[PDB]
Amino acid sequence: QAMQEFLTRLQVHLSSTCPQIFSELLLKLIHILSTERGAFQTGQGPLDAQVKLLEFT
Amino acid sequence: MTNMQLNQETTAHLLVSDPNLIHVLVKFLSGTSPHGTNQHSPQVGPTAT
């Protein structure tokens, strides 16, 4: 929930100014997690936070 | 293959002198369950040990 409110407040504060930078940051997050030696491939890390981040993206 | 004779250098010397064997041992000792399809123990059981 805390990560969801943090990402939601980033979206709200940067919707008017520059949402493309926040979208590119989210895409870079998915890219770094999804590559080799990452959290997605190795299975490490929280499943709930990654699933909620995916739903937010 | 450590029991196996090659026709010189023994095959155990070939295994240890090969640089790929250390990556084989790292990949075995850091394998865990990367797929994560089902809930599984991180241990490999007695037989692999």
mmCIF file of C-alpha atoms in Angstrom:
data_model
loop_
_atom_site.group_PDB
_atom_site.id
_atom_site.type_symbol
_atom_site.label_atom_id
_atom_site.label_comp_id
_atom_site.label_asym_id
_atom_site.label_seq_id
_atom_site.Cartn_x
_atom_site.Cartn_y
_atom_site.Cartn_z
ATOM 1 C CA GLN A 1 0.000 0.000 0.000
ATOM 2 C CA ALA A 2 2.823 2.440 0.831
ATOM 3 C CA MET A 3 4.529 1.804 -2.521
ATOM 4 C CA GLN A 4 1.161 2.233 -4.265
ATOM 5 C CA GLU A 5 0.554 5.624 -2.603
ATOM 6 C CA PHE A 6 4.130 6.709 -3.398
ATOM 7 C CA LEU A 7 3.756 5.851 -7.098
ATOM 8 C CA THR A 8 0.265 7.399 -7.164
ATOM 9 C CA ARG A 9 1.577 10.654 -5.677
ATOM 10 C CA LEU A 10 4.390 10.695 -8.255
ATOM 11 C CA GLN A 11 1.768 10.249 -11.000
ATOM 12 C CA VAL A 12 -0.470 12.995 -9.564
ATOM 13 C CA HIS A 13 2.391 15.465 -9.096
ATOM 14 C CA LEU A 14 3.877 14.853 -12.550
ATOM 15 C CA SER A 15 0.717 14.431 -14.657
ATOM 16 C CA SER A 16 0.612 18.157 -15.441
ATOM 17 C CA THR A 17 4.347 18.781 -15.814
ATOM 18 C CA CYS A 18 5.997 15.695 -17.325
ATOM 19 C CA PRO A 19 4.307 12.254 -17.253
ATOM 20 C CA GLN A 20 6.707 10.890 -19.891
ATOM 21 C CA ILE A 21 9.627 10.922 -17.433
ATOM 22 C CA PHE A 22 7.594 8.971 -14.862
ATOM 23 C CA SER A 23 6.463 6.499 -17.541
ATOM 24 C CA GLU A 24 10.069 6.078 -18.707
ATOM 25 C CA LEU A 25 11.168 5.574 -15.086
ATOM 26 C CA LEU A 26 8.539 2.845 -14.655
ATOM 27 C CA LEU A 27 9.634 1.213 -17.926
ATOM 28 C CA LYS A 28 13.296 1.358 -16.853
ATOM 29 C CA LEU A 29 12.287 -0.261 -13.551
ATOM 30 C CA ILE A 30 10.563 -3.109 -15.416
ATOM 31 C CA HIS A 31 13.583 -3.396 -17.732
ATOM 32 C CA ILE A 32 16.128 -3.630 -14.893
ATOM 33 C CA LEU A 33 13.993 -6.167 -13.008
ATOM 34 C CA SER A 34 13.216 -8.221 -16.119
ATOM 35 C CA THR A 35 16.750 -8.685 -17.477
ATOM 36 C CA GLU A 36 19.203 -11.468 -16.710
ATOM 37 C CA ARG A 37 20.468 -11.571 -13.095
ATOM 38 C CA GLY A 38 17.308 -9.702 -12.118
ATOM 39 C CA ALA A 39 14.557 -9.989 -9.518
ATOM 40 C CA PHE A 40 12.019 -11.274 -12.053
ATOM 41 C CA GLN A 41 14.179 -14.070 -13.480
ATOM 42 C CA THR A 42 15.723 -15.303 -10.230
ATOM 43 C CA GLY A 43 12.420 -15.183 -8.333
ATOM 44 C CA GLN A 44 13.850 -13.159 -5.448
ATOM 45 C CA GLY A 45 12.070 -10.185 -3.942
ATOM 46 C CA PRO A 46 8.438 -9.600 -2.985
ATOM 47 C CA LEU A 47 5.776 -10.997 -5.271
ATOM 48 C CA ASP A 48 3.079 -8.627 -3.965
ATOM 49 C CA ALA A 49 5.014 -5.389 -4.516
ATOM 50 C CA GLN A 50 6.113 -6.432 -8.015
ATOM 51 C CA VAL A 51 2.542 -7.439 -8.944
ATOM 52 C CA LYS A 52 1.168 -4.121 -7.644
ATOM 53 C CA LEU A 53 3.886 -2.226 -9.536
ATOM 54 C CA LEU A 54 2.921 -4.143 -12.691
ATOM 55 C CA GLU A 55 -0.749 -3.240 -12.171
ATOM 56 C CA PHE A 56 0.227 0.410 -11.679
ATOM 57 C CA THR A 57 2.234 0.355 -14.927
ATOM 58 C CA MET B 1 34.419 -39.159 -16.163
ATOM 59 C CA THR B 2 36.705 -38.665 -13.167
ATOM 60 C CA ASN B 3 36.823 -42.463 -13.148
ATOM 61 C CA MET B 4 37.347 -42.413 -16.927
ATOM 62 C CA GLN B 5 40.821 -42.673 -18.475
ATOM 63 C CA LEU B 6 41.698 -40.585 -21.543
ATOM 64 C CA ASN B 7 44.112 -41.730 -24.249
ATOM 65 C CA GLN B 8 49.170 -37.384 -20.861
ATOM 66 C CA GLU B 9 46.611 -35.637 -18.644
ATOM 67 C CA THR B 10 43.971 -37.310 -16.488
ATOM 68 C CA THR B 11 40.335 -36.328 -16.961
ATOM 69 C CA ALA B 12 40.077 -34.901 -13.439
ATOM 70 C CA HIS B 13 42.921 -32.549 -14.371
ATOM 71 C CA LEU B 14 40.930 -31.676 -17.507
ATOM 72 C CA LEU B 15 37.863 -30.952 -15.363
ATOM 73 C CA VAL B 16 39.594 -28.785 -12.751
ATOM 74 C CA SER B 17 41.822 -27.043 -15.313
ATOM 75 C CA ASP B 18 38.759 -26.165 -17.404
ATOM 76 C CA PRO B 19 37.443 -22.651 -16.619
ATOM 77 C CA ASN B 20 33.825 -23.700 -17.217
ATOM 78 C CA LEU B 21 33.711 -26.058 -14.213
ATOM 79 C CA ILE B 22 33.744 -23.179 -11.721
ATOM 80 C CA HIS B 23 30.726 -21.659 -13.497
ATOM 81 C CA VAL B 24 29.057 -25.092 -13.431
ATOM 82 C CA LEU B 25 29.581 -25.295 -9.666
ATOM 83 C CA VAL B 26 28.348 -21.712 -9.129
ATOM 84 C CA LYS B 27 25.249 -22.419 -11.245
ATOM 85 C CA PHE B 28 24.564 -25.542 -9.183
ATOM 86 C CA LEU B 29 25.112 -23.826 -5.828
ATOM 87 C CA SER B 30 23.107 -20.732 -6.828
ATOM 88 C CA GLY B 31 20.382 -22.503 -8.809
ATOM 89 C CA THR B 32 17.470 -22.287 -6.232
ATOM 90 C CA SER B 33 14.032 -22.214 -7.986
ATOM 91 C CA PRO B 34 14.255 -19.481 -10.642
ATOM 92 C CA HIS B 35 11.038 -20.500 -12.408
ATOM 93 C CA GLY B 36 8.954 -20.256 -9.224
ATOM 94 C CA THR B 37 5.945 -21.993 -10.780
ATOM 95 C CA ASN B 38 5.207 -23.923 -7.574
ATOM 96 C CA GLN B 39 6.176 -23.405 -3.941
ATOM 97 C CA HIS B 40 9.368 -25.390 -3.379
ATOM 98 C CA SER B 41 12.062 -25.685 -0.742
ATOM 99 C CA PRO B 42 15.380 -23.961 -1.574
ATOM 100 C CA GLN B 43 17.289 -27.032 -0.371
ATOM 101 C CA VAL B 44 18.213 -29.690 -2.928
ATOM 102 C CA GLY B 45 17.497 -32.748 -0.795
ATOM 103 C CA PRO B 46 19.947 -35.367 0.466
ATOM 104 C CA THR B 47 20.705 -37.123 -2.836
ATOM 105 C CA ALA B 48 22.129 -34.079 -4.651
ATOM 106 C CA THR B 49 24.231 -33.292 -1.568
#
